[model samples]
Target: RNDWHFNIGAMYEIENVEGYGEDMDGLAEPSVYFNAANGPWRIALAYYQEGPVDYSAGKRGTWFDRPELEVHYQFLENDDFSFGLTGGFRNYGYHYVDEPGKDTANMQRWKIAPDWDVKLTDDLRFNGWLSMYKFANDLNTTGYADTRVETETGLQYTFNETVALRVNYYLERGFNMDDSRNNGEFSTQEIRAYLPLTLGNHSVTPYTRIGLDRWSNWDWQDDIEREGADFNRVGLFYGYDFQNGLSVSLEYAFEWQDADEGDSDKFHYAGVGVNYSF
Candidate 1:
């Protein structure tokens, strides 16, 4: 079965800054994807717009920015396993104008990633992937001049189709290829649990996730400064899926950081989204 899919969503975040007023931002994305019948190719396009809620101060009113395009090809497919490769390009730009001596952040990158999935049993599955990115703008002088490599692996277990648990691990290693700068590596691990309650044509899923992140080996900082730059996040999400290909979700997250200097930053975010496909 091949068809087209469309999705639209929005998310908002508010920062908790000390003394000063809180800063807030929002993002909206509309996406289109198509699948080929009896084939292994798919393509997708998405557009993004983001800005502050009030659109005042440094907020540049929603600028129709950040368009993304991607294509995927499945090299192997079977009942219990599959392998695929994807190529995509994405842009990262901020709507906030420069303040004083600062400069606006505008960058783009191209990415190539390959992924594999395996089903060990009716109740368990595993997936792994590697991604390499080439940046249009230099992230650092020599730390990220070369391509960046990111790897991820995940395992999932289903309990009677009503309850499920997933664990994911990720590692990102930065390299300049010339050994000019000592930009290090980082790792993250996350665990999630979810329960699905289905009633006729409607389904409700409630899930919770916990994640830990660790950073190390920065050239400009000591090991303690780099190693201590770790954080943890806890998030909860509730999603509703309709039989007519419509979906909605809401999410909330809280993050706490371990810092070497100054106060540890802690913040919370709330977001909601809706989508439909025919």
Candidate 2:
């Protein structure tokens, strides 16, 4: 059998950045995706863009261009274990309203990753992915890294068909071709836990990210200066599937972070998505 799937999603975020002077609204990222799968092979094409929304002025639909394409193949699978390979290309960059064309962050990536899931016991499982990335053109750009490696691993315990808890770890290491252009070496780390619940066709998950260390080698700073904070995240996600190959999902998250300069910053994130298959 073969299947085709499509999805559309949007994410909105609000951050207390320098007083939000220009716009009353936050950033919005919208995406469109289509995928096809036959047996253990799946391929996907997706487009994504993000920009500020001028809610006070009642104008919408401003977006920056970015895209991603990916493929996955299940090389091994059984009742209690599965392993897959994924490869992808991604584009990333954004510009401000004032500096519309001055995007120093314009970049792209080619990545390959191994994804796996294994059941250790009747009620426990382990799953994760490790990705190796080779960036394109970022080596010539300032404040960017040439390569990156990221990994995410999690353990889940199920109490029943509808209730489960999962603990996860995530990390990303940045590498420069020379490792010395402003010490372009950097790393990010995070730990999170969540409870997954199911009620009929509807599902819900509540999660919290622990305060974890994140650092960069000045590569992300502007020519003049910069600094940072670790904002642990708290969020809730919900999804519902209909019998007619249609599904919808929603999520919201909050973050409150205190910096070394004694300033308190807050963030709000929300998202909505729809899916269908044929």
Best lDDT goes to which candidate? 2
Clashing pairs in 2: none
Which runs of model 1 end up more than 4 angstroms from their true locations? 1-38, 49-53, 57-65, 94-105, 138-146, 178-213, 216-227, 258-263
Q: For residues 95-189, could you state the per-residue lDDT of candidate 2 as single tens digits?
A: 43433334446678899999999999999999999999987664444445777899989999999988999999989887876645444567778
Write candidate 1's Cα lDDT for 1-278 as tens digits: 56554444444434332222343344333333333223677776766555444555544442325677888889989869999999989886644352333345556768999999899898888988889987665344212334578876788787765566666676665555555544544444455445555544445555544555544455423323445355566666767777677777676766666455656546666666666655
Clash count per candidate:
0, 0
Residue pairs whose backbone atoms clash in candidate 1:
none
Give the TM-scores of the predictions, in the order they appear.
0.71, 0.84
**Deviation from native of the Cα of residue 190 in model 2, angstroms:** 1.0
- Each prediction's whole-model lDDT (CA): 0.60, 0.74
CA displacement after TM-score superposition, residue 258 of candidate 1 (Å): 6.2
- Tell me the spans in candidate 2 whose CA falls farther than 4 Å from its real position: 1-25, 55-63, 93-106, 221-228, 258-263
